[PDB]
DNA sequence: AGCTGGT
DNA sequence: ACATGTGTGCTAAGCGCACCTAATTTCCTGACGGCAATCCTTACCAGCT
């Protein structure tokens, strides 16, 4: 629940446990797939949720599923970008973190369709981010100037970049 | 509109002495000189009894003063954020482009009466770049409704559109 | 009991405060751009003012060991001091530490030099730091202290470092639309050359505005953190009144010597403070008659009227003051004849407010 | 005969909780749950606590229903820091809440008109401080809107209600998702293999014990049964003021009253009068009372137009009676006398 | 019978509600991002201080209040700050502090309250006229002390300007007045434009009780007509308190 | 001891300081437009004056 | 003799 | 914000301008400072109630 220097609160993390189950045990297979995540730090129970994800077994891409195996790093790196500057532990844009959960809920309803990589990919999943980002940029730069429109447009181009770990 | 066109056409009919006394009244309200008020009344009264829509009085006075000072010609499709921006592409992006760009954005956060001097410097650099045409009707009906943010954002996005092309 | 001090200051073209990029500070108050002066800059300039020197007794330093080493002619204690500080809780030369100056100087010198220990030496140094509350600038601005929990010892503790600020300086909001102005300067190369050009073509931004400045004293807090005495409290209140009416933020004053003085003081005694920011939610647009100062005072007096009748507090009336020098700028030009004690001086209003504080005088208190 | 009331759920914020909330992450669902409108129902009757478990939840638990999405609101998260033993020790407890923002809904409640008739006089007048399922989430629209009627099928009732519009140039969802319960068309029917299970069915209330239910997705495009509604109601103020009235019928007759009330004379610089000036522009005048006008000669009315046309136009006027606007009027009249060109008109 | 304290409240530039990362909190309404203070924050600010305590049956039978999130009448405008804590002891270089960044927002808010008939009578405490006394305290105690926040560095305690109190029993927030965020036109104030929007919404909905209206020295009228949309264009401190007192009993 | 000098000077039609585009330096003092001469101009005119030769001795140079 | 704030 | 207060009695028509014109070089800053905590335990143990 804390957005620390290295984490940004997004949603249920169905994305994380895909490397060790689509490469080691069971792998690609037909049947409806179910995911359970019970996060816990030391001795504190913090949440519980579920996810019925779609899976038929149409092979796998190692690298793309490796990027999908941790989107939390990409989301935190997108959140930590400030409006202007280069300081490393500035909080960045805190209203980006307030639109990440709805965007995650909009992306994740066809989470297995995104998983199997048929027509859903990383490069077209962030297209839904644009609307909330336009209205957040309307809040952020409340000037009718050429410059403010330019910063709004540069704010729009923000999207989570994949990481190879 | 079918009311502002007659006002601009009547302004183009004005002879040298009338716009000379309009030139002498820069930054001065239409009260401290009798001939200036008489000229404004002659220009401004008879267009309300022939067409139901007329510009605002302050917009008409400011536009008459600026027209006398600069003396452009009326041509459709030559609004301020097109010629502006077209001249911004003829610039070095390092130093001079932010200078002229800030000079343009100063207009977007000002009320009608105080824009005489920023519009003066904008039209001064327009005159330096040898610009003959200016859509006085288009400028007038985007200025009479300058207090609503949709037309300001449309004007700014017109500057963006002319800059990217 | 708490004291409100309001000013309306018009300033010459100046840059008293800038952000990282160098622009004067701006805030979106009432849907329009208003020029802003940061509260911390005003607090610092009033701290460093030329009349607070009898009361300037707080130091905000990370070079505590340097302060110890300065007052030691031949006894070099700067590595031992550094390791004592490093296990005090600060971890490095340290973070910023607030304390009284002379107290830490002499008695940290006597408690550091003795070769009696290294762990309890750090513990007693930390206790000396934490007990350093005998300073009214700390009492006004406020101070907490948070040492690390990693680079420390398990046998070193910290007492409660709770000090509340007895002053709420507001940011100086402009009374109109901010017109940020761009200054273009060059730097002349003194020796000549082929190019005949500037050494450095640079960017500076300045703003001329009539700032609504607003401070507030929590006198009850000012004495609940300055122990049982009231003499030092009255001296600090008078010192702040003199400093705020007399000093200016030390921004680019060498390039913009805007040392203009507050054209308005409004001191009102009550238990529910008010800023007259809503007096200028409507931007002040000047007319041909009068000036920006008078129109701003007129809107302020209109607001004082409908918050002295519409929001009337006749259980605790206003003791609303002025600094109208020989009545140059009256407040009630049309109806607001509620200025009970309109004067034209500064020491008189200082003495008056310490008189409603209690049985004090201006000259007798000015010795603590 | 009216078997259905269309509940109108609309506010700045709202939330009907989902099942995945036991710890500090408290979440919602993208539909008003059955016990997210039945709680509103129980509050609307004015009771609560353990009374709803008997004869109030089973009194309608045999009754199917359907919900409609006018606009899908986005999910918002609010920071919430419970102070625990602070206004135990000062250990501040932590949490995060899920809020559905700017979402309008329409629930159906079908089967019989006696309970709907009892329920129609329960939404507006009887209250126990009803809200949108969250205690701090106000209903921004009259919940008693969309009056009841007979529409036999679930889709006919859910699509036979007009759809609102806030401003004129507003995007409108062309597909309206429908959340419907399970209809056992014959005994022994098995659910289709797309119906997700929702756990919104209470059998007790405090503490919450629950039953699950089957939910069938359904669709609705606009046009065939549902349609946009009249909007009107201008949300643009821009303070009103009339202008430019020469004569309708009541300026000819009203000019003379102060002309000869003041004996055919001026008022400031007394002389034979021609026209009438207007003070106190509360209304510019289609109907003018005879104690606001000012019959006044040509030159000083020209000076009045001097002073008014210069500087602010506003609604405050000159009123040449209180002697503060005197020197300017006389000076403007002096330059009128010195500089007027009658051959150049006016 | 139900009490709806529809309240406007402008704010001088200062941050009041802070999220994890320190920003002013935000809400989504009308297809735009607007500034927000949490209902818990303002509700605790109504408690925890003795000026209002001059009430434990009302914020605890549970409690008796519906406090809404402060929806801005316009779009959110979050700004950012830049502070430098000086060294004040001369070192080899200058500047020492955290050199961090703060952030703030100035907004004009709206909220809605709800106190029902039995929700105030069964509140009781010990009297039956307490069901009028506590409410009479509330109608201007809700506009008594702005919460808290970074007031020692951002001093903002701007009192509200326009206050509604309605006795309509059907609980409806007037937030649909602010479906379109309030723009600014030069001849009217932002608070005046917001109050005109509230008035324009007031003239609606009655087509398909009274309007008890507060304007201090009636600078803000609910409609620029003789056909006043509240018909009670008055108000002075506890005059409204006593008028609600003998409206209830 | 702080010596201050306040000078009221009437100047003929002139352009004694200008920005990049050639307009004289203007400021908005009191809400109205006033012409302005920068303090660096008077500072360097004091420095490069016809009585400060005996008091020179600085070079803020790059060569 | 147990209890509670600290390790 | 022309009309309307005529009061012996207040005209009026023809006429209103074209063209050459707007330049550049270069000059643009380095460094120092960037917060700590606290929001579930290797849990029993001894200061003392
Ligand atoms: Mg006259």
Nucleotides of G under 7 A from a protein CB: 7
Output the distance from B152 CA to H27 C1' rounded to whole Å: 37
Question: Which residues of chain D neighbour B37 with C-beta distances below 8 Å?
Answer: 305-306, 309-310
Is the CB of D250 within 7 Å of strand H? Answer: no
Chain CA centroid to CA E146, Å:
9
Nearest residue to D114 (alpha-carbon basis) of D46, D35, D55, D59 = D59
* Cα–Cα distance for residue pair E70/E68, rounded to 1 Å: 6
* Cα–Cα distance for residue pair C277/C270, rounded to 1 Å: 18
The answer to whether C6 and C261 are in contact (CB under 8 A) is no
Residue C208, token pair as written in the block: 């001329």
The answer to whether C204 and C223 are in contact (CB under 8 A) is no
Measure Cα distances from E71 to A165, B95, C27, D138, D270 in Å. 42, 42, 20, 11, 59
- D21: three-class secondary structure by DSSP: coil
* Cα–Cα distance for residue pair B159/B81, rounded to 1 Å: 4
- In three state form, how does the secondary structure of C72-107 look? CCCCCCCHHHHHHHHCCCCCCCCCCEEEEHHHHHHH
Nearest CA in chain B to A144: B153
At residue F26, what are phi and psi to the nearest 5 degrees? -115, 150
Is the CB of B48 within 7 Å of strand H? Answer: yes
Question: Which residues of chain E neighbour B147 with C-beta distances below 8 Å?
Answer: 183-186
Nucleotides of H under 7 A from a protein CB: 1-5, 16-17, 22-23, 25-29, 31-41
Is the CB of D275 within 7 Å of strand H? Answer: yes
Nearest residue to D29 (alpha-carbon basis) of D78, D73, D63 = D73
The answer to whether C17 and E82 are in contact (CB under 8 A) is no
Q: What is the DSSP string of F7-45?
A: ------S----B-TTSPBPEEEETTEEEE---HHHHHHH
Is the CB of A88 within 7 Å of strand H? Answer: no
Q: Among B111, B112, B148, whose Cβ lies nearest the Cβ of E183? A: B148
Count CA atoms closer than 13 A to D107's CA, side-chain side. 23
- What sign has the CA pseudo-torsion C319, C321, C327, C330? negative
Count CA atoms closer than 13 A to A29's CA, side-chain side. 11
Residue B28, token pair as written in the block: 């001065």
* Cα–Cα distance for residue pair A112/A120, rounded to 1 Å: 9
- D76: three-class secondary structure by DSSP: strand
Count CA atoms closer than 13 A to A20's CA, side-chain side. 5
Nearest CA in chain E to C101: E89
Nearest residue to C39 (alpha-carbon basis) of C165, C139, C123 = C165
The answer to whether D172 and D185 are in contact (CB under 8 A) is no
**Residues, chain E:** 249
B6 CB near a chain D CB, below 8 Å?
no
Nearest CA in chain D to B38: D346
Say which experimental method was used.
cryo-EM
* Cα–Cα distance for residue pair D86/D94, rounded to 1 Å: 13
Nearest residue to A97 (alpha-carbon basis) of D323, C287, E19 = E19
- What sign has the CA pseudo-torsion B137, B142, B143, B145? positive
Residue E117, token pair as written in the block: 């008939």
The DSSP 8-state label assigned to residue D104 in this structure reads E
Q: Which residues of D are annotated as a binding site for Mg(2+)?
A: 269, 297, 300
Question: Which residues of chain A neighbour D20 with C-beta distances below 8 Å?
Answer: 12, 47-50
Nearest residue to D11 (alpha-carbon basis) of A154, E178, C162, C151 = E178
Whether C190 and F60 lie within 8 Å, measured CB to CB:
yes
State the chains in contact with E (3 or more Cβ–Cβ pairs under 8 Å). Answer: A, B, C, D
Show the CA angle centred on residue E59, arms to residues E54 and E65, nearest 5°.
110
Output the distance from D275 CA to H2 C1' rounded to whole Å: 12
- B151: three-class secondary structure by DSSP: helix
Q: Which residues of D are annotated as a binding site for Zn(2+)?
A: 269, 297, 300
E126 CB near a chain A CB, below 8 Å?
no
Q: How far is the CA of D307 from the centre of ligand 1 (A)?
A: 14
Instruction: Please give all residues whose CB falls under 5 A of ion ligand 1, grouped by chain where several chains appear.
Output: D 266, 268-269, 297, 300
- In three state form, how does the secondary structure of C271-291 look? CCCCCCCHHHCCCCCCCCCCC
**Preferred mutation among F7, F19, F23, F28 to probe C, highest tally of C CBs within 10 A:** F28
Is the CB of D23 within 7 Å of strand H? Answer: no
B109 CB near a chain C CB, below 8 Å?
yes
- Which positions ≥6 away from A154 have C-beta within 8 Å? none
* Cβ within 8 Å of E, A 122-141: 135-136, 138-140
Burial label for E184, CB within 10 Å (0-12, 13-18, 19+), is: middle
Question: Which residues of chain B neighbour A145 with C-beta distances below 8 Å?
Answer: 105, 108-109, 156
Tell the residue number behind the tokens 């100047």, with chain if given: F11
Question: Which residues of chain E neighbour B148 with C-beta distances below 8 Å?
Answer: 183, 185
- Which positions ≥6 away from E171 have C-beta within 8 Å? D127, D129, D130, D131, D138, D139, E2, E4, E66, E114
Paired with E12 in beta bridges are none
How is chain A split among helix, strand and coil, in percent rounded to 5?
A: 40, 10, 55
Q: How many CB atoms lie within 10 A of CB A161?
A: 12
- What sign has the CA pseudo-torsion C327, C332, C337, C341? negative
Question: Which residues of chain D neighbour B30 with C-beta distances below 8 Å?
Answer: 309-310
Nearest CA in chain E to D233: E204
**Preferred mutation among B28, B115, B117 to probe F, highest tally of F CBs within 10 A:** B117
Q: How far is D89 from chain C (nearest CA, A)?
A: 15
* Cα–Cα distance for residue pair D47/E89, rounded to 1 Å: 68
* Cα–Cα distance for residue pair D92/D85, rounded to 1 Å: 8
Is the CB of A44 within 7 Å of strand H? Answer: yes
* Cα–Cα distance for residue pair B95/C201, rounded to 1 Å: 10
Tell the residue number behind the tokens 């000072």, with chain if given: B69
Q: How far is the CA of D273 from the centre of ligand 1 (A)?
A: 8
State the chains in contact with B (3 or more Cβ–Cβ pairs under 8 Å). Answer: A, C, D, E, F
Q: What is the DSSP string of B81-113?
A: HHHHHHHHHSS-TTTHHHHHHHHHHGGGG--TG
Is the CB of B99 within 7 Å of strand H? Answer: no
């Amino acid at each position: 629940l804390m957005s620390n220097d290295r984490y940004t609160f997004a949603d249920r993390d169905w994305y994380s446990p895909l490397f060790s189950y689509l490469h080691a045990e069971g792998n690609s297979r037909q049947g409806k797939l179910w995911l359970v995540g019970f996060a816990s730090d030391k001795a504190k129970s913090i949440d519980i949720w579920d996810k019925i994800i779609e899976l038929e077994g149409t092979d796998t891409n190692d690298e793309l599923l490796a990027q999908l195996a941790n989107r939390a790093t990409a989301l935190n790196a997108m959140r930590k970008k400030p409006l202007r500057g280069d300081f490393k532990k500035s909080v960045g844009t805190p209203q980006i973190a307030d639109i990440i959960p709805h965007a995650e809920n909009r992306i994740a309803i066809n989470a297995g369709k995104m998983t199997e990589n048929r027509g859903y990919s990383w490069q077209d999943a962030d297209t839904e981010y644009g609307e909330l980002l336009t209205k957040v940029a309307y809040s952020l730069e409340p000037a009718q100037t050429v410059d403010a429109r330019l910063k709004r447009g540069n704010f729009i181009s923000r999207k989570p970049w994949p990481i190879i770990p | 509109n079918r009311g502002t066109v007659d006002f601009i056409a009547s302004l183009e009919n004005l002879k040298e002495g009338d716009l000379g006394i309009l030139r002498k009244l820069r930054g001065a309200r239409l009260d401290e000189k009798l001939p200036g008020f008489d000229l404004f009344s002659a220009l401004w009264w008879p267009l309300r009894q022939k067409n139901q829509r007329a510009p605002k009085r302050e917009v008409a006075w400011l536009i008459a003063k600026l027209f006398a000072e600069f003396r452009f010609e009326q041509r459709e499709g030559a609004t301020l954020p097109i010629l502006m921006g077209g001249i911004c592409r003829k610039l070095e992006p390092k130093k001079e482009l932010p200078r002229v760009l800030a000079r343009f954005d100063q207009l977007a956060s000002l009320d009608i009466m105080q824009m005489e001097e920023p519009l003066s410097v904008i039209m001064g650099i327009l005159r330096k770049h040898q610009q003959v045409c200016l859509d006085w009707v288009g400028l007038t009906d985007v200025l009479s409704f300058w207090e609503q943010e949709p037309v300001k954002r449309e004007w700014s996005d017109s500057f963006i559109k002319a800059y990217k092309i | 009991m708490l004291i409100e001090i309001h000013m309306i200051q018009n300033h010459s073209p100046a840059n008293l405060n800038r952000d990282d990029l160098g622009a004067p500070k701006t805030c979106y108050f009432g849907g329009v751009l208003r020029s802003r002066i940061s509260s911390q800059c005003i607090k610092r300039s009033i701290r460093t003012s030329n009349d607070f020197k009898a009361l300037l007794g707080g130091v905000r330093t990370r070079r505590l060991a340097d302060l110890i080493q300065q007052e030691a002619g031949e006894t070099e204690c700067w590595k031992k001091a550094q390791e004592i500080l490093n296990k005090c809780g600060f971890k490095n030369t340290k973070m910023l530490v607030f304390m009284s100056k002379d107290k830490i100087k002499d008695l940290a010198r006597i408690v550091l030099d003795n070769s009696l220990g290294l762990t309890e030496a750090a513990q007693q140094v930390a206790n000396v730091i934490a007990q350093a509350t005998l300073a009214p600038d700390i009492a006004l601005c406020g101070r907490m202290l948070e040492p690390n929990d990693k680079d420390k010892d398990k046998k070193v503790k910290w007492s409660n470092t709770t000090v509340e600020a007895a002053l709420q300086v507001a940011h100086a909001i402009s009374t109109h639309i901010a017109r940020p102005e761009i200054d273009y300067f060059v730097a002349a190369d003194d020796v000549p050359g082929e190019d005949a050009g500037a050494g450095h073509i640079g960017e500076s931004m300045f703003a001329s505005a009539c700032f609504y400045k607003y401070f507030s004293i929590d006198w009850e807090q000012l004495v609940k953190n300055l122990k049982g005495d009231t003499n030092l409290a009255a001296h600090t209140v008078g010192a702040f009144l003199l400093a705020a009416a007399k000093t200016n933020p030390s921004g680019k004053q060498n390039s913009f010597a805007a040392h203009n003085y507050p054209d308005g003081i409004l001191v009102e005694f009550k238990n529910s403070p008010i800023s007259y920011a809503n007096a200028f939610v409507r931007p002040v647009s000047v007319v041909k008659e009068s000036d920006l100062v008078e129109q701003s005072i007129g809107q302020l007096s209109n607001y004082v009227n409908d918050i002295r009748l519409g929001y009337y507090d006749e259980q605790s009336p206003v003791i609303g003051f002025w600094f109208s020098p020989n009545n140059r700028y009256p407040l009630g030009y049309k109806h607001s004849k509620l200025a009970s004690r309109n004067i034209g001086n500064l020491n008189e209003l200082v003495g008056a407010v310490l008189d409603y504080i209690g049985g004090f005088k201006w000259e007798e208190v000015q010795k603590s | 005969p009216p078997n259905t009331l269309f509940l109108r759920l609309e506010g700045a914020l709202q939330s009907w909780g989902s099942n995945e909330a036991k710890f500090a992450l408290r979440r919602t669902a993208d539909a008003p749950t059955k016990s997210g409108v039945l709680g509103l129902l129980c509050a609307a009757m004015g009771i609560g606590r353990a009374e709803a478990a008997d004869s109030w939840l089973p009194k309608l638990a045999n009754l199917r229903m359907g919900v409609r999405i006018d606009r899908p609101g986005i999910r918002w998260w609010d920071f919430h820091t419970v102070g625990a033993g602070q206004r135990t020790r000062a250990e501040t407890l932590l949490s995060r809440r899920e809020y559905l923002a700017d979402a309008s809904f329409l629930v159906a409640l079908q089967g019989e008109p006696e309970l709907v008739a009892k329920l129609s006089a329960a939404l507006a007048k009887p209250v126990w401080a009803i809200y949108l399922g969250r205690k701090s989430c106000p209903p921004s629209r009259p919940v008693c809107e969309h009056p009841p009627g007979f529409y036999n099928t679930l889709e006919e009732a859910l699509s036979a209600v007009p759809l609102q519009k806030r401003w004129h140039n507003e995007p409108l969802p062309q597909i309206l998702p429908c959340v419907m319960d399970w209809i056992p068309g014959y005994d022994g029917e098995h659910a289709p293999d797309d119906a997700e299970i929702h756990y919104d069915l209470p059998v007790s209330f405090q503490p919450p014990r629950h039953l699950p239910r089957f939910v069938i997705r359904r669709e609705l495009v606009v046009g065939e049964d549902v349609q946009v509604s009249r909007e009107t109601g201008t949300s643009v103020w821009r303070p009103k003021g009339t202008r430019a009235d020469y004569n309708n019928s009541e300026y000819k007759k009203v000019r003379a009253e102060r002309l000869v009330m003041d004996h055919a004379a001026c008022m400031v610089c007394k002389a034979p009068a021609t026209t009438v000036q207007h003070v106190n522009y509360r209304r510019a005048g289609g109907k003018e009372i005879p104690e606001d006008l000012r019959a006044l000669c040509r030159l000083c009315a020209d000076a009045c137009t001097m002073l008014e046309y210069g500087s602010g136009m506003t609604t405050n006027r000159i009123d040449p009676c209180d002697p503060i606007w005197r020197e300017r009027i006389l000076a403007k009249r002096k330059e009128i006398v010195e500089f007027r060109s009658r051959g150049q008109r006016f």
